[PDB]
């Protein structure tokens, strides 16, 4: 059958607090299997399903390290969006990222995802071809241009077509 | 294993 893996990373900036609230949730098909929350006392990726209990502490460690870097990515990129949209630095804003892979019955990639939404609205999205981007407005046009120039599609495609698919199969065997 | 580190916006 057709399976999918999806990650949703969201960061919400608040008034006064220099660190935005950052969350990340993973899904294998319909089921949420992993979650990281920055509000927690000891922020880390914790399993949300019994079949994820069979991953070593090394898995949870690097995954949490990555999450820590993602927070920093969001922190900086929320600020650049303020500049793009000419918004006040004393407000509340949200940036959401979603990426993942849909695999066929033959375990091969069908559709890869890499997309961002700012303040609930569209920002930029990698197309089905995994070669081009759809920018929502003029601000997202600045990102498209630099990502076209930097080869961002090729970069994301490498992950989506390999490691994403391979890990999905791994999790399916676990479940 | 998560996505590699994303490019600047």
């Amino acid at each position, epitope marked *: 059958g057709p399976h999918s893996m999806r990650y949703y990373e969201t960061a919400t900036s608040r008034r006064g607090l*220099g660190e935005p609230r950052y969350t990340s949730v993973g899904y294998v098909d319909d089921k949420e299997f992993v979650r990281f929350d920055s509000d927690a006392e000891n922020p880390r990726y914790e399993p949300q399903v019994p079949w994820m209990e069979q991953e070593g502490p090394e898995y949870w460690e690097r995954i949490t*390290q*990555v999450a820590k*870097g993602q927070e*920093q*990515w969001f*922190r*900086v*990129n929320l*600020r*650049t969006l303020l500049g793009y949209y000419n918004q006040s630095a004393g407000g509340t804003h949200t940036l959401q990222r979603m990426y993942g892979c849909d695999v066929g019955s033959d375990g091969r990639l069908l559709r890869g995802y890499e997309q961002f939404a700012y303040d609930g609205c569209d920002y930029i999205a990698l197309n089905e071809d995994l070669r081009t981007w759809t920018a929502a407005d003029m601000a997202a046009q600045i990102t498209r241009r*630099k990502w076209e120039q*930097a*080869g*961002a599609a*090729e*970069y994301y*495609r*490498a*992950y989506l*077509e*390999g*490691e994403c698919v391979e890990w999905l199969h791994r999790y399916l065997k676990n479940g | *294993q998560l996505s*590699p*580190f*994303p*490019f*600047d916006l």
Partner: T-cell receptor
Amino acid sequence: EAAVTQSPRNKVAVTGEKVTLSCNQTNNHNNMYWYRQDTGHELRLIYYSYGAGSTEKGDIPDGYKASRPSQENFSLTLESATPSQTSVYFCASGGGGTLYFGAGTRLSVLS
Amino acid sequence: QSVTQPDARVTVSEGASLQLRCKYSYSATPYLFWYVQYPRQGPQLLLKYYSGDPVVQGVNGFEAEFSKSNSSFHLRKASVHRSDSAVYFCAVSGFASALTFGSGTKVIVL
């Protein structure tokens, strides 16, 4: 490329001296990195930064301090210079994937 | 994670072709780069590989070939000039997009 520039270009320090290396980039890249290369061989990561206010220990952070006060500036401080810290220091900026390097800073710490 | 450049030094005649070896060992997705470094200068990008065509064209007559099976990213130039004498570094992208460099290969063109 004159987009990433370092200061000073050359420095001779005495053991125990506090030394600060400065890096300016005009690329508007969020990420900045400090490497050192001892014998024209492997560059090793000392410190890096995700953006203003961010400072992260690299592979070999012992003996250094870093400071990212703004987007364009990333400084590296040797608090108490030791002879083992003589080498060529390289700063880089990146928006992801490709790093862009400065021309280097030659630092000699006297034995 | 790591890249290995098996030949530390290469000597070739002016006008000969050049072939520099690089091997990587990286569980994750391999983002590969070749840089050149001339005396008193920093590393300069030659080319990179992310995905797609395994043969990539680069600056100043260089090209490279990615091979997943052999875990290699060999660099090539058909007709080297004296000005190509330098140190060549293979690199792989890691955490926070910091590059991890190979030990380098010094090229001498007689």
